[PDB]
Design an enzyme around this catalytic site. Structure first.
Site, PDB file in Angstrom:
ATOM      1  N   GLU B 178      -6.467   6.841   9.449  1.00  0.00           N
ATOM      2  CA  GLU B 178      -5.839   5.549   9.617  1.00  0.00           C
ATOM      3  C   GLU B 178      -5.731   5.160  11.089  1.00  0.00           C
ATOM      4  O   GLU B 178      -4.732   5.476  11.759  1.00  0.00           O
ATOM      5  CB  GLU B 178      -4.464   5.526   8.953  1.00  0.00           C
ATOM      6  CG  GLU B 178      -3.736   4.162   9.085  1.00  0.00           C
ATOM      7  CD  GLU B 178      -2.343   4.129   8.482  1.00  0.00           C
ATOM      8  OE1 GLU B 178      -1.832   5.133   7.962  1.00  0.00           O
ATOM      9  OE2 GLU B 178      -1.731   3.074   8.549  1.00  0.00           O
ATOM     10  N   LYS B 220      -8.577   3.913   6.347  1.00  0.00           N
ATOM     11  CA  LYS B 220      -7.473   2.986   6.162  1.00  0.00           C
ATOM     12  C   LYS B 220      -7.375   2.142   7.437  1.00  0.00           C
ATOM     13  O   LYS B 220      -6.925   2.619   8.479  1.00  0.00           O
ATOM     14  CB  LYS B 220      -6.149   3.715   5.851  1.00  0.00           C
ATOM     15  CG  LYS B 220      -4.930   2.811   5.632  1.00  0.00           C
ATOM     16  CD  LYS B 220      -3.693   3.599   5.142  1.00  0.00           C
ATOM     17  CE  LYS B 220      -2.511   2.694   4.914  1.00  0.00           C
ATOM     18  NZ  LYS B 220      -1.363   3.340   4.198  1.00  0.00           N
TER      19      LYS B 220
END
Ligand SMILES: [Cl-]
Ligand SMILES: [Cl-]
Lengths: 336, 336
Positions: B178, B220
């Site tokens: 992420e 992400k």
């Protein structure tokens, strides 16, 4: 670099690779071609270089298999024996004309190379000589030895390739970037695989930092194999598996195509590896095609031998070898 | 990391995103969740954190839309009011269980952050607590100011994300990496676009240098937008265009999916951007789905308010919001 301008680059990139077509690389410098000539007993005259390119470009039916040709700068100034600009032979056939724009290599660090020519690249792209060109090529070369390619060398070459790419695009030319992994060397296939992943992922970094239009870039890549001085064997299936894994790991969906270089591999091997990679399963958006110099033209030179009475047979070999490359580009070489 | 082991990772990655499904992120630390609670008048007791996660995980029908849930470490030790391990609620529903494995952020250079926790990451992956987990999450955060993100910060965070990714994979867990681009900041959309291309291309470099199995990694990502302190406006179509261009420019065919974070954007906006990006044309191999915390659970908290008599209505809001996210993940939110 407005919307229309960018779309033109993407269309050119796709046109070159339509319908299983690939690229005929004919961009050898007088020095590189001359060495090839001398091995086979042909004099390195400008006339023989001109005639060689005429023999290639005037081959009947070659446009069914060849979507673009990479020319050497000197060839843009040359004509056929009948008087017609050599570029006109290709234009009449609907084949895209490319220009090799690097100025060769110079020493970098210990035992490595960088490619050169950026300083006047923009001026050269604007030359009236190249007005018919729609794409370009620039080569870097990565030597392999113990701790080499070095990270510095990977970074510098990728930076140079990306800087060339953006200048091409700003001049309306589709850049082919060629990060060649040199075959002459002693390295395992696992090492080639790992270094290929380093080089291609780093090349994509620099292309992105230079804000290159990714759908308007072609990548001319080496197959993943062990080095020619390694005792390690491989087969087409293994080259296909490792090369496709490396590409799936590194190349963004937006790239339109990968075109393999023949790189010292035989014509037979280069075409066989291409066929094998195109039979591999594994979802991808890009074409897997060819940008061959030796794989397509060694047979032509070996047949021709500098004698006009061998030209027809030399052209037949080009057409047949080009057919096989194109079938390989669709994974169909075993078929029909 | 033998063939079978790698194929399992790829299957897990695809299972999470089957059929327009996405990820419910529920991995907030006690401190992060507590701040959310306190804004809405809910006491930050462990009991209220446990009940909140029970409310989410026990929502009837949520498995039609949610393919995986990212848990906080403390939640693996918790049970429902009825006695059942909270992980069992999800397992019975066939939802994949994930673990957030970063230990938060620490200061880096001037005004930037790196994420931490690598030193015992391998030991933690092997914890009996997480034996039911099949995927993991690790967050870095990129602050934006004048000459920031710095290249050093991009490199270091991408290196950390890649090192986490390989350790996860070696332990049989699919890593979600992420690289969040922080929304709170003053930057134009063009700047976000250009920096997103830098970050994602660099992340792919480090994943490749660490020889991560690319088909077993989920990314992400932040939507490409201007910063919350910018006066610049944008619409879903513009976010879709810029975000998809950035992704097509940077993310290899082998990546199985991109899952967007909600990031301070509203639930409505986050789902609308998702729908818009899934209506965009542009060939790609990866899924475009969601990994939302706030976008899916703000409404649940706002409805619930710490009162048992609001739980049914809170669950209804989760299910309805999850439905919309899933429809957005297929580009169908306007339909039926
Ligand atoms: Cl050359
Ligand atoms: Cl958190």
């Amino acid at each position: 670099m407005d919307c229309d301008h960018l779309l033109r680059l993407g269309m050119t990139a796709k046109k070159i690779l339509e319908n299983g077509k690939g690229i005929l690389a004919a961009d050898e410098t007088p020095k590189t071609l001359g060495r090839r000539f001398e091995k086979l007993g042909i004099t390195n005259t400008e006339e023989n270089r001109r005639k060689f390119r005429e023999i290639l470009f005037s081959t009947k039916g070659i446009e069914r298999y060849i979507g673009g040709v990479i020319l050497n700068q000197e060839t843009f100034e040359q004509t056929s024996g009948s008087g017609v600009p050599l570029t006109e032979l290709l234009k009449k056939k609907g084949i895209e004309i490319g220009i090799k724009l690097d100025k060769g290599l110079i020493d970098y660090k210990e035992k490595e190379k960088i490619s050169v020519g950026l300083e006047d690249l923009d001026l050269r792209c604007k030359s009236s000589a190249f007005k018919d060109a729609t794409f370009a090529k620039w080569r870097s070369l990565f030597y392999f030895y113990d701790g080499i390619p070095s990270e510095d060398c990977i970074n510098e070459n990728c930076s140079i390739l990306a800087k060339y790419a953006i200048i091409c695009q700003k001049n309306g030319l589709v850049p082919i970037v060629e990060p060649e992994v040199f075959l002459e060397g002693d390295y395992s296939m696992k090492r080639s695989y790992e270094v290929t992943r380093q080089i291609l992922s780093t090349l994509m970094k620099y292309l992105n930092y230079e804000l290159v239009y990714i759908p308007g870039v072609l990548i001319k890549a080496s197959y993943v194999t062990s080095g020619q001085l390694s005792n390690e064997k491989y087969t087409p299936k293994k080259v296909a598996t490792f090369t496709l894994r490396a590409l799936l790991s590194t190349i963004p969906c937006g790239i339109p195509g990968i075109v393999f270089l023949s790189g010292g591999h035989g014509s037979e091997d280069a075409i066989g590896f291409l066929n094998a990679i195109n039979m591999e399963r594994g979802c991808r958006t890009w074409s897997l095609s060819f940008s061959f110099a030796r794989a397509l033209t060694d047979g032509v030179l070996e047949t021709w031998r500098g004698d006009d009475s061998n030209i027809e047979e030399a052209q037949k070999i080009l057409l047949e070898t080009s057919f096989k490359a194109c079938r390989g580009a669709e994974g169909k070489l075993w078929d029909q």
